[PDB]
């Protein structure tokens, strides 16, 4: 009982974009107020906690195109 | 009892976009007020918690196109 | 008892869009007030909690096209 | 008792859109008031909770076209 | 007792739309008031809860066309 | 023709008040929205105008007693 | 023709008040939104104008008693 | 024609107040938003204008008693 | 025609107040946003203008008692 | 025609206050945002202008008692 397996995917996808002119942006946040209180903290695993923050972000790329691709093969007996 | 398996997907998808001119944007947030209170905290797994935040974000890409693709093959006996 | 399996999907889909001019946007939020209270917190799994937030977001892409695609094959005996 | 299986779907779908000019938008929210109270919190599974929020969002893409597609094949004995 | 199966769907669907000019929009919400109270909270499954919110959304795409498609084949013995 | 005038008012008025305990007060207003528009403004006198306001006041005195008294005498010929 | 005038008012008024304990007060206003527009402004007199304000006041005196008194005499010929 | 004038007012007024204990006060205002627009401004007199303000005041005296008194005499011929 | 004038007012007024203990006060303002626009400004008199301010005040005296008194005499011929 | 004038006011007013203990005060303001714009400025008189400010004041006296008094006499012919 022999087994033959072939795995030949093919991709030619393209992702493009065009933009002429870009700018003239203003971002003005006026302060804030935050307060937290806690007593016990215990994490034992793949944890990604984040406590008590005040953040301002300006993310302006000229491009901004993303592509994700995964393959997986599993054989058992 | 032999087994033959062929796996040959094909893709030629395209994702494009065009834009002439882009800008002239204003973003002005006026403050806030936040308060939290807790006693016990215990996570043991793939956790993604986030407690007590005040955030402002401006995300202005010129492109902004996304593409996700996954393949999976499993064989058992 | 032999088994023959062929898996040959084909795609040529396209996703495009055009836009001439884009801008002249205003966003002005005037504050707020938030308060939470809790005693016990215990998560042990793939959890995505989020407690006590005050957020402002401006998401203005020039493109903004999305495409999701998945394939899966399972064989058992 | 042999088995023959063929799987050959074909797609040529297209999704497009056009827009000349776009802008001149105003968004002005005037504050609020929120208060929550709880004692016990225990999640153990794929949970997506969200407690006590005050959010403002402006999502203005130039494109905005979406396409979802899934395939699945299962064989048992 | 052999079995022959053929699976060859074909699609050529198209989804388009046109729009000349678009804008001149105002959105002004004047505050609010919310209060919740609870004692016990226990979820163990694929849950999507959301408690105590005050939200404002402006979703103005230039395109806005959507397309969903699924295929499934199951074989048993 | 002589004139005699006597002006001898007498007052012994008293204004008192008692209060044992006082407190435990909450005041939580949730925002608003106001807009005015005008072109011409001309005042020439003892004017006390007030245009376009959003006010919150908490006036909690422990006493709060008031007393007004005026006298006037006029002689002509 | 002689004139005799006597002006002898007498006052013994008292204004008192008592209070045992006083406190435990909360004041939490959640934001707002105001906008005004005008073109011409001309005042020439004892004017007390006030345009375009957003105010919050907490006035908590321990006493708070007030007393006003005026006298006036006028003689003409 | 001689004139005799006597002006002998007498006052013994008292203004008091008592308070045992005083405190435990909270004041938390959450932001705001104000905008004004004008072109011409011309005042020529005793003017007390005030334009475009955002104020927060906490006025907590231990005493707080006030007393106003005026006298005036005028003679003409 | 001789004139005799006597001006002998007498005052013994007292203003007092007592307070045992005083404190435990909190004041937390969370930001703001202000914008003004004007073109012409011309004052020629006793003017007390004030334009475009953002102020926070905490005025906590232990005493706080006030007393105003004026006298005036005018003679003409 | 001789004239006799006597001006003998008498005052014995007292202003006192007592306070046992005083303190434990917090003052925490969280930022702000201010912007002004003007073109012409011309004052020629006793003017007291004040433009474009952001101020924080803590005025905590142990005493705080005030007393104002004026006298005036005018003679004409």
Which tokens is J68 given?
């104002």
* Chain J interface mutation, best of H48, H63, H68, highest count of J Cβ atoms under 10 Å: H63
Instruction: Determine the distance in angstroms separating the CA of D41 from the nearest CA of chain B, rounded to an integer.
Output: 10
Asked if D1 and C1 touch (Cβ cutoff 8 Å), the reply is yes
Asked if H39 and G40 count as a contact pair (C-beta separation under 8 A), the reply is yes
d(CA I8, CA I6): 6
Distance CA C60, CA A19 (A): 14
Rounded Cα gap, residues H35 and G34, in angstroms: 7
User: Nominal resolution in Å?
Assistant: 3.5
Which residue in C17, B32, D35, J59 sits closest to H59, CA to CA? J59
Which residues on chain B are in Cβ contact (under 8 Å) with D23? 24
CA dihedral of H41, H42, H47, H50, whole degrees rounded to 10: 10
HSE, side-chain direction, 13 A CA sphere, residue F27: 20
- Cα–Cα distance for residue pair J62/J18, rounded to 1 Å: 9
Of I33, E64, C35, the residue nearest J35 (C-alpha): I33
DSSP state of J39: S
What is the enclosing helix (H) or strand (E) of B67? Answer: strand B66-70
- CB H10 within 8 Å of CB I10: yes
Neighbours of chain A (3+ CB pairs under 8 A): B, C, H, I, J
CB atoms within 10 A of CB F23: 14
Structure solved via: cryo-EM
3-state secondary structure of D33: coil
CA distances from A40 to A43, B40, B43, C40 (A): 10, 5, 11, 10
Task: Report the candidate in B51, C47, C36 with the shortest Cα–Cα distance to residue E38.
Answer: C36
Query: DSSP state, D47?
Result: B
Closest CA to J11 of E30, D54, D77, H12: H12
Nearest to D73 by CA among C7, J29, G16: C7
DSSP codes, B33-74: -EE---S--EE-SSB---EEEEEEEEE--S---EEEEE--EE
DSSP J13-38: -EE--EEEEEEEE--------EE---
Is-contact G43 F44, C-beta < 8 A? yes
Q: Is the sign of the CA dihedral D23, A30, H57, I47 positive or negative?
A: negative
Spatial CB neighbours of H54, under 8 Å, sequence gap ≥ 6:
G53, G54, G55, H32, H34, I32, I33, I34, I53, I54, I55, J32
Tell me the two tokens of residue I23.
């404190």
Closest by CA position to H62, among listed I62, I16, F58, J24: I62
Taking CA–CA distances from B75, the nearest residue in chain A reads A75
How far apart are alpha carbons H17 and F62 in whole angstroms? 9
User: How far apart, in whole angstroms, are the C-alpha atoms of residue C75 and residue B72?
Assistant: 11
**Which residue in chain H has the smallest CA separation from G66?**
H66
Question: Distance between CA D17 and CA B19 in Å, rounded?
Answer: 13
Strand partners, G23: F23, H23
CA angle B17, B22, B27 (to 5 degrees): 125
CA distance B30 to chain J (A): 8
Which one-letter DSSP state was computed for residue D31? -
Q: What angle do CA H19, H20, H25 make, to 5 degrees?
A: 85
Cα-Cα-Cα-Cα dihedral of C37, C38, C39, C43, to 10°?
-150
Per the CB < 8 A criterion, the answer to whether D37 and E52 are in contact is no
User: For residue I2, what are the CA distances in angstroms to F4, G3, H33, H34, I76?
Assistant: 18, 12, 69, 66, 15
User: Chain C within 8 Å of E64 (Cβ-Cβ)?
Assistant: no
Burial of D58 (0-12, 13-18, 19+ CB in 10 A): buried
Work out the minimum CA distance from C60 to partner chain F, whole angstroms.
Answer: 26
Indicate which of G26, G30, G34, G54 best probes the interface with D, i.e. most D CBs within 10 Å of its own CB.
Answer: G30
Chains C and G touch, contact meaning at least 3 pairs of CB atoms under 8 angstroms apart: yes
Cα(D28)–Cα(E27) distance, integer angstroms:
6
Task: Write the CB contacts of B57 (distance below 8 Å, at least 6 apart in sequence).
Answer: A56, A57, A59, C55, C56, C57, C58, C59
Task: Find which of H31, H35, H56 to mutate to test the B interface (most B CBs within 10 Å of its CB).
Answer: H31
Question: Which residues of chain J have a CB within 8 Å of the CB of I10?
Answer: 9-10
How many contacts does C have with I, using Cβ atoms within 8 A?
Answer: 5
Question: Which class for I54: exposed (0-12), middle (13-18), buried (19 or more C-beta within 10 A)?
Answer: buried
Give the tokens for residue E51.
Answer: 């408690």
**Tokens of residue E74, six digits:** 């199951």
Give D19's Cβ-side CA count (13 Å radius).
29
Cα–Cα distance measured from residue I64 to residue J8, given in angstroms and rounded to the nearest whole number: 30
Q: How far apart are CA D67 and CA D69, in angstroms?
A: 7
Token digits of residue A31? 């302060």
State whether B33 and H31 contact (CB < 8 Å).
yes
Comparing CA positions, the residue from E27, B50, F17, E3 lying closest to residue D75 is E3
DSSP letters spanning F1-65: --EEE----EE--EE--EEEEEEEE--------EE---S--EE-SSB---EEEEEEEEE--S---
d(CA J47, CA I47): 5
| Alpha-carbon gap, residue B63 to A62, rounded angstroms | 7
Q: Which residues of I touch A34 (CB under 8 A)?
A: none
Residue F39: count of CB within 10 angstroms of its CB:
9
Which residues are registered as beta bridge partners of J74? Answer: I74
User: Chain I window 12-41: which residues touch H at a Cβ cutoff of 8 Å?
Assistant: 12-41
Could you give the CA distance from residue I62 to residue J60 in angstroms, rounded to a whole number? 8
User: Three-state DSSP class for A35?
Assistant: strand
Partner-chain contact H19 F61, CB within 8 Å: no
Cα-based distances in Å from E77 to B76, C73, D3, D22: 16, 17, 12, 58
| H-run or E-run covering C43 | strand C42-43
C58: closest CA among C26, C33, C31? C26
- Nearest C-alpha neighbor of D14 from the set B24, F9, J73, B12: B12
3-state SS string over chain I? Answer: CCEEECCCCEECCEECCEEEEEEEECCCCCCCCEECCCCCCEECCCECCCEEEEEEEEECCCCCCEEEEECCEEECC
Residue with tokens 């400025």: J41
Shortest distance between the Cα of A60 and any Cα of chain I, in A, equals: 24
- Strand D51-59: give its sheet, edge to edge: A51-59, B51-59, C51-59, D51-59, E51-59
Contact I62, H62 (CB under 8 A): yes
- For an interface test with A, give the residue of I26, I27, I29, I30 to mutate (most A CBs within 10 A): I30
Q: Which residues, including other chains, have CB under 8 Å from residue E53's CB and lie 6 or more apart?
A: D34, D50, D52, D53, D54, D55, E34
Beta strands in chain D (DSSP E): 3-5, 10-11, 14-15, 18-25, 34-35, 42-43, 51-59, 66-70, 73-75
Q: What is the DSSP letter of E47?
A: B
Evaluate whether H31 touches C31 at the Cβ level (below 8 Å).
yes
Asked whether C and J share 3 or more beta-carbon pairs under 8 angstroms, the answer is: no
Sign of CA dihedral B34, F53, H35, G43: negative
Instruction: Give kind and range of the element (H or E) at residue H1.
Output: none
- Find, in chain I, the residue whose alpha carbon is nearest to that of H9: I9
Element (H, E) at B34: strand B34-35
Q: Cα D2 from chain centroid?
A: 43
G39 and F40: CB-CB below 8 Å? yes
Three-state secondary structure call for residue D36: coil
Q: Is D52 left (phi over 0), alpha (psi -120 to 50) or beta?
A: left
Q: How close is the nearest chain C Cα to the Cα of G23, in Å?
A: 22
């Amino acid at each position: 009982g022999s087994v033959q397996i072939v795995y030949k995917p093919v991709d030619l996808s393209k992702v493009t974009s065009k933009c002429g002119s870009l700018g003239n942006i203003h971002h003005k946040p006026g302060g804030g107020q935050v307060e937290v209180k806690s007593e016990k903290l215990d994490f034992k695993d793949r944890v990604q906690s984040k406590i008590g923050s005040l953040d301002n972000i300006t993310h302006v790329p000229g491009g901004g195109n993303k592509k994700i691709e995964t393959h997986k093969l599993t054989f058992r007996e």
